[PDB]
Amino acid sequence: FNCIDWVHKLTLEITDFDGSVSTIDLGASSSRFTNWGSVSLSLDAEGISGSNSF
Amino acid sequence: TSAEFSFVGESTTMRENKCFEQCGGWGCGCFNVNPSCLFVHTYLQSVRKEALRV
Amino acid sequence: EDPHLRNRPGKGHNYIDGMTQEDATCKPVTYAGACSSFDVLLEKGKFPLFQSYAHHRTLLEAVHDTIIAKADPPSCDLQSAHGNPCMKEKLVMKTHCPNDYQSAHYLNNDGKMASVKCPPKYELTEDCNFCRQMASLKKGSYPLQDLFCQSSEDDGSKLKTKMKGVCEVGVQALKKCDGQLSTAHEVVPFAVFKNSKKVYLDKLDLKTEENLLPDSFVCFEHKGELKSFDISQCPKIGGHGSKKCTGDAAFCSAYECTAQYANAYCSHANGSGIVQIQVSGVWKKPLCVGYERVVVKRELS
Amino acid sequence: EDPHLRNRPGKGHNYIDGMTQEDATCKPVTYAGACSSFDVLLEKGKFPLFQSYAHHRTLLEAVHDTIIAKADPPSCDLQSAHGNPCMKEKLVMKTHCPNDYQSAHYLNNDGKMASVKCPPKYELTEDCNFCRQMASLKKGSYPLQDLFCQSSEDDGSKLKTKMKGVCEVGVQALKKCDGQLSTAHEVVPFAVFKNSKKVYLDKLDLKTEENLLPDSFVCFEHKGELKSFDISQCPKIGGHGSKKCTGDAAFCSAYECTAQYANAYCSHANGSGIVQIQVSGVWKKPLCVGYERVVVKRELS
Amino acid sequence: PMIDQLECTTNLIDPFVVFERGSLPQTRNDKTFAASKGNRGVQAFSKGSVQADL
């Protein structure tokens, strides 16, 4: 396969208030679903451009 | 022609009919959770008692 | 869907206490006969979830197979004086019911067996919320839900309904909302675990696998149509039994294929046995999972 | 031009011990009489190889011509006690038995000729394993392979099954696989040589050469298309014999043509000759090459 | 084709040669491409800091 847009993914776990731990991720500006709300990313970081020739 | 404006008449007047989607439920003034209908019957009329031939 | 529509494994009993006026056709349930408590389950466009998984048992079949217990009373009287216990659990359910019906069973909060019954000779209405006076009256009940039951041994008592921002969903009451209240007609599925209550969920992630239990294999004999054969008579590997059995690799990999001494050709089922659900991220096998149509009261303030 | 599909060269016998009750019509095999062990061999869309190789011997004709050895016992009973030796090498044979037929033969992995049958009153099933109850019982032998045989005496004991990715096909243990086994059925041709076993081959190359053999011409009888005629009664070149025959240049160039003094207009058969297979890149003379469905245990881990 | 013989040869490109020629981790410009530590898919390792808001 090939890459067209490198998404800044951050492996972020979520430890709830009771004690349960849920491991998820966040990329660019995506959202997830948890047992208490929704987590999302507001700002990315860096970014590799020009990957169509690989 | 809207259902709430068919009793007015079909006179020769530059008129138009619009319908905007609004809110529903008991919080707005309805008994159903489905959105309500906003029947708008706009007609244009004259203002000045004289005209100009451009 | 599933090809086995009328064939029911095991006992296949669909009769409740107080409405045993149809045991001539609903006991057992075969291709012939007009069972009023099973014909509406195979209707197109009504209960598709039951048509997706049809190789497992139903609610009443689970009650008769010592899987789901009964409530008290198991069959409420929807006409008796001084009120009745089965009233608030029915008025909160928005389900349509055809005419010429006398009973309508559903699932309560404790996961037991709650149902209503009209005294003879009364019938139901469009919303089947009350019995009215009087074609031919159906001698059975009407499934108020679209659920299917099976045999599972996975505990789930601590997995209570975690629906946030909802006052009273379905029948259960999460809290006592004293401020605002938003009543809407929304569809929410439900799931029942071992030693738990009617747990409601948002999404329904099913799972289809197989196992070694006899409920995952079918057999049929050859004689001069289709004739079913018992599955509990196939001997095990190195054990004992009754009549010999044989089949393909899927059947020989579980039991003992004798081939030359067999009496009926067995085949593998079309994906049945263990049906797990995805709850709390992990995979657990529920007992009686479904997809009903009730009224959900969410929050506002 | 077009050769017939019923003119059996050589003896033309299709019967076996124990099920030889059809000797009144299958000995020999001609237009008169419906041989049960030959009607299914000419079904369109079932055995294309046997229809492509018309003037060629079969397994039974090879047995009667002292070409393929016989098993012991050649006719194993299915409903007999003390087990059944003719089941361990046949259970991994994916076959299909229709109806009416009571017995069925197959080419075992030992290069011999085995067969099974049901005692009265029983018939075959759909898996060709046990026996069931039913109309009429065709006392014969239903063929389960699409093989063609011929007369050859080429030794080939230094050639065995050397397939790639196959641990144990049928009952012959090939290479030692310490991992798991992939028990599954597929398609694969094979070829049996003289003084050897049933050698399985993944690929094969057929070669047909035209010669001046008596089994390479068809004759149309007439008064003096149309019907067939016995070619063994035609005289040879430079001599005489029983009756008289004539034909085109292909028939007159080998035998003697009497033109108007003949009784059958012969021609060249388009579908005969000596068929040779290419094994290990070396052209050899096979005996019976077939194409069935067996259970190949490939690799996995 | 050789009358009776049939020698068929294909000049197929073996992907294992390219897979074993330049396999990750590899050094490309200032970044370092490597494998993943969770979900399936190729990732990239940077040498900068973390500037993001959750």
Contact call for C246 and D78, based on CB within 8 A: no
As a whole number of angstroms, the distance between CA D129 and CA D88 comes to: 11
Contact call for C260 and D129, based on CB within 8 A: yes
Q: What is the dihedral sign for C-alpha A21, A24, A29, A34?
A: negative
Q: What is the dihedral sign for C-alpha D49, D51, D54, D56?
A: positive
Q: Do chains D and B touch (3 or more CB pairs under 8 A)?
A: no
Q: Which of E38, E48, E53 sits opposite A43 (nearest CB)?
A: E53
- Can you list the positions of beta strands (E) in A1-54? 9-15, 21-27
In which region does residue B29 sit, left (phi positive, over 0), alpha (psi from -120 to 50) or beta (all else)? left
Contacts of C249 in chain D (CB under 8 A): 183-184, 295
Angle at D119 between CA D113 and CA D125, to 5 degrees: 75
Contacting residues for A21 by C-beta, under 8 A, at least 6 apart = A13, A14, A15
State the smallest CA–CA distance between residue C186 and chain B in angstroms: 10
| Tokens encoding A45 | 């970081």
D109 vs D150, D187, E42, CA distance in Å?
Answer: 19, 16, 51
As a whole number of angstroms, the distance between CA C216 and CA C231 comes to: 9
C28 vs C22, C33, C138, D62, CA distance in Å?
Answer: 10, 10, 17, 57
Phi, psi of D59 (to 5 degrees): -70, -45
E33 vs A48, E23, E24, E46, CA distance in Å?
Answer: 11, 10, 7, 9
As a whole number of angstroms, the distance between CA C2 and CA C259 comes to: 28
As a whole number of angstroms, the distance between CA C258 and CA C2 comes to: 29
As a whole number of angstroms, the distance between CA C191 and CA C290 comes to: 7
As a whole number of angstroms, the distance between CA D254 and CA D227 comes to: 22
Contacts of A22 in chain C (CB under 8 A): 281
As a whole number of angstroms, the distance between CA D285 and CA C46 comes to: 67
Contacting residues for B26 by C-beta, under 8 A, at least 6 apart = none
As a whole number of angstroms, the distance between CA C210 and CA C269 comes to: 9
| Tokens encoding D190 | 């094979």
Phi, psi of D261 (to 5 degrees): -90, 15
As a whole number of angstroms, the distance between CA A36 and CA C270 comes to: 39
- Can you list the positions of beta strands (E) in chain D? 75-77, 103-106, 114-117, 123-124, 131-132, 142-143, 148-149, 166-169, 172-173, 182-192, 198-200, 206-209, 217-221, 264-268, 274-279, 282-284, 288-298
- State which H helix or E strand residue D38 sits in: helix D36-39
CB C145 within 8 Å of CB C97: no
Contact call for B25 and C300, based on CB within 8 A: no
As a whole number of angstroms, the distance between CA C116 and CA C119 comes to: 10
Q: How many angstroms separate the most distant Cα atoms in chain C?
A: 75
CB atoms near residue C47 (< 10 Å): 19
CB C62 within 8 Å of CB C288: yes
As a whole number of angstroms, the distance between CA D272 and CA D52 comes to: 9
**CA closest to A35 among chain C residues:** C162
DSSP, res C298: E
Please classify residue B24 by burial: count the beta carbons closer than 10 Å to its beta carbon, then call 0-12 exposed, 13-18 middle and 19+ buried. Answer: middle
CB D19 within 8 Å of CB D117: yes
On whether any CB of chain A is under 8 Å from the CB of E2, the answer is no
Location of structure tokens 């208490």: A36
Angle at C46 between CA C40 and CA C47, to 5 degrees: 80
CB D128 within 8 Å of CB D85: no
| Tokens encoding D283 | 């052209």
CB D251 within 8 Å of CB D245: yes
**CA closest to C279 among chain A residues:** A35
Helix residue ranges per DSSP H, chain E: 15-21
As a whole number of angstroms, the distance between CA D99 and CA D138 comes to: 9
Peptide bond into C120 cis (omega under 30): no
As a whole number of angstroms, the distance between CA D232 and CA D241 comes to: 10
Q: Are strands D75-77 and D114-117 parallel, antiparallel or unpaired?
A: parallel
CB D26 within 8 Å of CB D138: no
b/e burial code for range B5-16 (CB count within 10 A of at least 16 → b):
eeeeeeeeeeee
Among residues 11-30 of chain B, which lie with CB inside 8 Å of chain C?
25, 27
DSSP, res E13: P
CB atoms near residue C295 (< 10 Å): 18
Q: How many helices (H) and strands (E) does chain C have?
A: 5, 15
b/e burial code for range D96-113 (CB count within 10 A of at least 16 → b):
ebeeebbbbbbbbbebbb
As a whole number of angstroms, the distance between CA C289 and CA C68 comes to: 13
Q: Map B1-51 to HEC letters.
A: CCCCCCCCCCCCCCEEEEEEECCCCCCCCCCCCCCCEEEEEEECCCCCCCC
CB C251 within 8 Å of CB C238: no
Contacts of D129 in chain C (CB under 8 A): 246, 259-260, 262, 265
State the smallest CA–CA distance between residue E6 and chain D in angstroms: 9
On whether any CB of chain E is under 8 Å from the CB of A25, the answer is yes
Q: How far is CA C181 from the centre of its chain?
A: 32
As a whole number of angstroms, the distance between CA B37 and CA E45 comes to: 55
What is C121-146 written as a DSSP string?
Answer: TEE--SS--S-EE--PPPSS----S-
On whether any CB of chain A is under 8 Å from the CB of E51, the answer is yes
CB C288 within 8 Å of CB C192: yes
Which residue numbers come right before each break in chain D (C to N over 2.5 Å)?
134, 224
**CA closest to C186 among chain B residues:** B33
On whether any CB of chain E is under 8 Å from the CB of A14, the answer is no
CB C113 within 8 Å of CB C69: yes
Residue C231 identity:
I
Q: How many helices (H) and strands (E) does chain D have?
A: 4, 17
CB C123 within 8 Å of CB C99: yes
CB C228 within 8 Å of CB C219: yes
According to DSSP, the residues that pair with B16 across neighbouring strands are B42
Location of structure tokens 């998820």: A24
Helix residue ranges per DSSP H, D116-175: none
On whether any CB of chain D is under 8 Å from the CB of C53, the answer is no
Give CA torsion, residues D33, D34, D37, D39, to 10 deg.
Answer: 140
Angle at E22 between CA E17 and CA E28, to 5 degrees: 160
CB C290 within 8 Å of CB C147: yes
State the smallest CA–CA distance between residue C184 and chain B in angstroms: 6
**CA closest to E6 among chain D residues:** D205
Q: First-to-last CA distance in chain D?
A: 55
Contact call for B25 and C182, based on CB within 8 A: yes
Size of interface B-C (CB pairs under 8 A): 6
As a whole number of angstroms, the distance between CA A31 and CA C124 comes to: 48
Phi, psi of C122 (to 5 degrees): -110, 165
Of D203, D183, D208, nearest to D191 (Cα)? Answer: D203
Question: Resolution of this PDB entry, in A?
Answer: 13.3
Of D151, D142, D155, D190, nearest to D55 (Cα)? Answer: D151
What is D163-174 written as a DSSP string?
Answer: -TTEEEETTEE-
According to DSSP, the residues that pair with D265 across neighbouring strands are D220, D246
Of C107, C108, C126, C128, nearest to C118 (Cα)? Answer: C128
As a whole number of angstroms, the distance between CA C25 and CA C8 comes to: 13
According to DSSP, the residues that pair with D57 across neighbouring strands are D149
Contacting residues for C6 by C-beta, under 8 A, at least 6 apart = C29, C30, C31, C38, C42
Angle at A29 between CA A23 and CA A35, to 5 degrees: 35
CB C62 within 8 Å of CB C13: no
Contacts of C161 in chain A (CB under 8 A): none
Experimental technique used?
A: cryo-EM
| Tokens encoding D133 | 């109850």
State the smallest CA–CA distance between residue C286 and chain A in angstroms: 20
